[PDB]
Design a binder for this molecule. Structure first.
Ligand SMILES: O=C1NC=C(F)[C@H](O)N1
Ligand SMILES: O=C1NC=C(F)[C@H](O)N1
Ligand SMILES: [Fe+3]
Ligand SMILES: [Fe+3]
Lengths: 423, 423
């Protein structure tokens, strides 16, 4: 078994490092003063970057791989997406869900993702997808720690037996309680649905992840209730507000007032760049707003924010290979986090910040932690992002679970020349 | 020498095709009714997509690889970018320019780009970069047909001897006349600068490519003068309006009136997605506009529009590997061209439409044309875009000038499994 990772670069650190492994855990981390020789039982990072695993804080594995079935989302909006999904949800089968979820999970394993939070639509009396996903969770455990959010896609108060079905999903084992206040029939149902969500999370000791204000409506302010209830219950670390795209349209004075509460509450935020740039701004003609939440300001204020892929070939997104560096690339551009340091520090948005969002207790390159880490063939975060590098090796429990032999490009000039796009 | 390309898929066509090569040209194209066997002198496309070469209609090779030298563009705006570039322009040397231009050109060759239009700043009495680029043009000719735009970065009427320097650049051999009306001191200088640009293009029989209305100013309407002068002179095919980002902010009534003229004029449009999403919207707080020109509407109206990378690690853009599929990916998202057919047809924005913009006379997979083509390991445009595939082979004059051995990804589950991200 592997005993050491050598010649590793670490974000924010100078030089090279050696990571000693023992019994599936990291036993010690020591700085090197030069390049170490390879040897049996040593995985050579070759001066590449070593980081804890990529994380997918927000994806829909029950809907993945279904775009165009039975119809396509023509308008490219959240609302038509839900209608198209409703048509597909009526055709679900146990095996159908497991096969599609596993297809995307394999792409995630290949992409160095070892932690995934999937929402599963529980606005369905049969709970077909949830039952299938609970089995997938057990099956994929050796490679990915999968969290399941009981997501009441059609509302808690606005769907028949919505609250009972949400609770049934928790009794069956869902890890996180979801909600979607802006989709409820009225603002009052939206606020009430959040009180019910928090009560269920406290009753069952579960996390919370709300699809919150995913709409270009400057009056959609459910995020303040999510943060206030979390603060009141002293449970911010266990709470996440996904999307908050309406915040892109708020006036600045209200946003400033709100930010004090967001920071005090300690709740987490997920932005989904690939899907948000596609679904938001659809009701504008020109100019057209970007529609991503206030990521730059959250980072400046010390509010935990991270990025999710959200959808992979489904009603809300026709593309994707479940690649977090690609999600990061889109977010940095749309949010204008284009300074050198902002880009270089971008990896935090798909690693550490996402681990905090999932309330992970065993994450990071530190002594005592499980030996879960990935190696990128790049010098730092900036380089990895610019070149959209693959994951050279993914290690879990001290064993290699995925590897990518890099592509080899040659140009035939006066003589052949290898091209690696580096400077 | 290669005699045939077999098992090729072609955009918009059903089945497989064989492309016969003779004397460096395409002699004939014949449909296949099944998979053909490989043999010596036959390049097997392996049911991948064969298209004419990618094109880069807008890049700055004189500024490439200079980001942060001597200072960084902190605000991420066009205006500070020009100031930072001015500082770097004062430090230019002949060899400096040739080395950096060649570095990016090699990445382009590796990425299947055989046609490139580079702007070169001629607001410089020494014309240092232009002299260097004219040599690079000759040196890179076996691999890339490079067009040089004499670009008066600091204005024609607003810079000392600007008009004389612009004409001197044409007398030295620049292929295209540039302008930047929105950067001139006054609207009147902007309009007058365009009359001077057109007069020079007719005097020397050169093409025109104007950095046009690259500003979030709803009153920046220099595009109507570019189109009207082209229509008057009957030279639309030879004229290009780059950027036109102000069009993102125009009211709809004026835009509708304008579109009639744009179509009648026959001029070309270049949008630069990676740079536009970064530099535009910088004066908005929230909501923030996207700032790309009206690409979707141009396509619906039959107006020729295409995509450029614009900058590769320079004052206006800190990233890039000169990859056109990556430029296309950003443009489809920001412009909301996310329908299946829109994404699949996206390749036109980086191939045929760009060739028209460069007024190319020998481009396309057709009998009689030079055997210049590339092979993508994908089933169609949608697949190539979704998976961001590399260029498997680039063929020029019937010879392979670049090749990429694809990466190999494996996940170690109960048994090893190859992952190609396909469905
Ligand atoms: O409500 C939603 N359902 C599915 C999505 F992909 C989007 O995150 N929002
Ligand atoms: O005026 C400009 N100079 C350089 C750029 F990259 C941008 O295209 N605009
Ligand atoms: Fe979602
Ligand atoms: Fe430019």
């Amino acid at each position: 078994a592997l005993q050491t990772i050598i010649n590793a670069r670490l974000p924010g650190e100078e030089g090279l490092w050696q990571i000693h492994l023992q019994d599936g855990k990291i036993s010690a981390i020591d700085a090197q003063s030069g390049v170490m020789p390879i040897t049996e039982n040593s995985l050579d990072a070759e001066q590449g970057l070593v980081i804890p695993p990529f994380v997918e804080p927000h994806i829909h594995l029950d809907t993945t791989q279904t775009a165009g079935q039975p119809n396509w989302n023509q308008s490219g909006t959240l609302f038509e997406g839900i209608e198209r999904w409703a048509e597909r949800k009526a055709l679900l089968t146990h095996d159908d869900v497991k096969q599609r979820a596993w297809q995307t999970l394999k792409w995630q394993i290949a992409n160095g993702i070892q932690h995934v939070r999937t929402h599963v639509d529980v606005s369905d009396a049969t709970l077909t997808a949830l039952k299938a996903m609970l089995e997938v969770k057990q099956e994929v455990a050796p490679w990915i720690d999968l969290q399941i959010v009981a997501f009441p896609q059609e509302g808690i108060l606005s769907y028949p037996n919505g609250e009972a079905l949400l609770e049934e999903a928790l009794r069956l084992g869902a890890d996180v309680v979801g909600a979607i206040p802006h989709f409820e029939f009225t603002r009052e149902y939206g606020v009430e649905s959040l009180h019910k969500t928090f009560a269920l999370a406290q009753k069952y000791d579960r996390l919370i992840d709300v699809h919150c204000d995913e709409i270009d409506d400057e009056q959609s302010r459910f995020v303040e209730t999510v943060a206030a209830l979390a603060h009141h219950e002293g449970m911010g670390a266990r709470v996440t507000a996904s999307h908050t795209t309406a915040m892109h349209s708020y006036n600045g004075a209200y946003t400033s007032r709100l930010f004090r509460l967001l920071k005090m509450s300690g709740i987490n935020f997920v932005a989904n760049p690939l899907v948000n740039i596609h679904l938001q701004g659809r009701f504008d003609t020109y100019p057209k707003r970007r529609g991503i939440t206030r990521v730059k300001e959250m980072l400046e204020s010390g509010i935990n924010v991270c990025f999710g892929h959200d959808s992979v070939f489904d009603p809300w997104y026709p593309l994707g290979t479940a690649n977090m560096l690609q999600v990061l690339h889109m977010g940095l551009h749309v949010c204008q986090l284009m300074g050198y340091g902002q880009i270089n520090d971008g990896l935090n948005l798909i690693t550490h910040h996402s681990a905090r969002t999932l309330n992970l207790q065993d994450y990071g390159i530190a002594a005592g932690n499980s030996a879960n880490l990935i190696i990128l063939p790049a010098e730092n975060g900036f380089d990895a992002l610019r070149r959209q590098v693959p994951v050279r090796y993914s290690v879990r429990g001290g064993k290699v679970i995925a590897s990518t032999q890099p592509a080899q490009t040659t140009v035939y000039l006066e003589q052949p020349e290898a091209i690696d796009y580096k400077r």
